[PDB]
Amino acid sequence: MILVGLEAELGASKRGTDKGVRRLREALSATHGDVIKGMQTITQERCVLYKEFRYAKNFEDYYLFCKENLIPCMKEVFEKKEFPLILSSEHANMFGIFQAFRSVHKDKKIGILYLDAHADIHTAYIHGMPLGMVLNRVRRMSESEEKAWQKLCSLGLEKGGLEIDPKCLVYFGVRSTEQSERDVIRELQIPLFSVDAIRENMQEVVQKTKESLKAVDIIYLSLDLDIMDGKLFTSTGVRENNGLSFDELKQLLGLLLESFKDRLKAVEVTEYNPTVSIKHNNEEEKQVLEILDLIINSCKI
Ligand SMILES: [Mn+2]
Ligand SMILES: [Mn+2]
Numbered sequence: 001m002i003l004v005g006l007e008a009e010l011g012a013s014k015r016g017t018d019k020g021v022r023r024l025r026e027a028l029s030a031t032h033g034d035v036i037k038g039m040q041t042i043t044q045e046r047c048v049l050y051k052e053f054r055y056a057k058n059f060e061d062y063y064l065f066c067k068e069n070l071i072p073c074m075k076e077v078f079e080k081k082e083f084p085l086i087l088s089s090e091h092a093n094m095f096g097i098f099q100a101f102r103s104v105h106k107d108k109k110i111g112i113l114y115l116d117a118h119a120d121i122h123t124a125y126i127h128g129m130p131l132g133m134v135l136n137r138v139r140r141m142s143e144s145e146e147k148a149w150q151k152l153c154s155l156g157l158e159k160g161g162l163e164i165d166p167k168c169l170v171y172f173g174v175r176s177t178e179q180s181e182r183d184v185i186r187e188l189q190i191p192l193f194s195v196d197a198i199r200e201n202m203q204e205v206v207q208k209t210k211e212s213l214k215a216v217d218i219i220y221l222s223l224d225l226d227i228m229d230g231k232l233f234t235s236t237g238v239r240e241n242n243g244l245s246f247d248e249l250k251q252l253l254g255l256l257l258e259s260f261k262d263r264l265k266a267v268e269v270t271e272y273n274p275t276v277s278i279k280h281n282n283e284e285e286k287q288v289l290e291i292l293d294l295i296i297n298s299c300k301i
Contacts, residue, residue, distance in 0.1 A: 001029060001082055001083045001084070002077060002082045002136070004046050004084055004087060006050050006090075007047055015178045016237065016273035017273045020275075021088075022176065028042060028293045030293065033045060044291065050065075052090075052092070063148075066096045070093075070100070071099055071100045072100075075156075078100055084266050085267055085292070086266060087271070090128075091224055092128030095130040096155075098220060100156055101266060102161045105161075105218055106157075107160040111263070113174065113260070114170070115221075116224035116226065117174065117224065117243055118224070118240070119185060121177075121184050122181050128213075131166050135184070138170060144288065166188035167190065169191075170190075170193070171191065172227065173227040175195060195242055196211060199248060202248075202251060206252075213260070214261065216293050219263045219265065223272055225270070235277040236273075245286050252295060253291070254298065257294075258279065
């Protein structure tokens with residue numbers, strides 16, 4: 001297995017999520033990352049630098065960085081046969097990472113399992129819009145600006161890739177969105193399983209997920225820890241109430257990993273920010289580490 005750890009090229013020590021990533025990397029290294037009973041699960045720990053997207057503030061810089069640094073590095077990772085566990089730090093990085101994923105699997109239909117309290121389709125003022133860029137639904141805007149966005153949303157695809165089928169993006173636990181995001185979801189008919197549907201019948205949720213993904217060749221799982229209830233888990237930047245319990249997430253994760261074991265080619269876990277926790281113990285870190293053990297132990301086979 002390959003462990004990818006994202007870190008901001010600039011000002012990483014000021015970022016609570018980057019600190020989360022370094023904590024998890026060191027923790028992993030000791031365990032999964034070391035020889036346990038004659039076996040080393042994580043054979044490589046790779047650090048990947050990223051640049052924060054500040055929209056108008058640094059559009060060009062971000063564009064160039066992604067095209068020249070982030071995407072090329074992630075493609076190198078996705079080109080290896082070994083299963084990759086990606087610590088993204090911040091969900092916004094999912095864009096560059098996923099474009100690299102699409103680039104490597106250019107002739108494959110890709111499905112997305114997105115566990116998050118947010119839809120991440122449109123920037124709200126809080127959370128980015130990686131999916132809005134993956135889906136090409138970024139939207140006042142000049143023709144030059146739309147040209148710039150088309151340029152960006154297209155990175156890493158101009159030797160081609162398929163466009164993502166909005167119906168193959170499956171949302172889990174989404175509960176905090178903008179009407180503009182809800183309009184895209186309704187219009188594109190993107191399957192969305194709420195906290196209640198998951199809690200009421202996880203089995204049906206998974207079965208309906210299979211139906212939506214029956215035609216895809218490979219799957220990408222992106223997990224945002226804020227899918228867990230904001231009161232129960234506080235080590236995340238944007239906490240949302242009415243979320244899943246720690247055990248519910250573990251149950252949903254186990255089923256999804258087992259149900260899609262064959263086509264799952266990558267797992268991304270993001271938004272772990274220990275600096276904003278309101279608790280004074282090891283509880284939350286232990287929970288994240290347990291989430292990681294569960295993912296690693298299921299996918300290493
Ligand atoms: Mn997110
Ligand atoms: Mn989120």
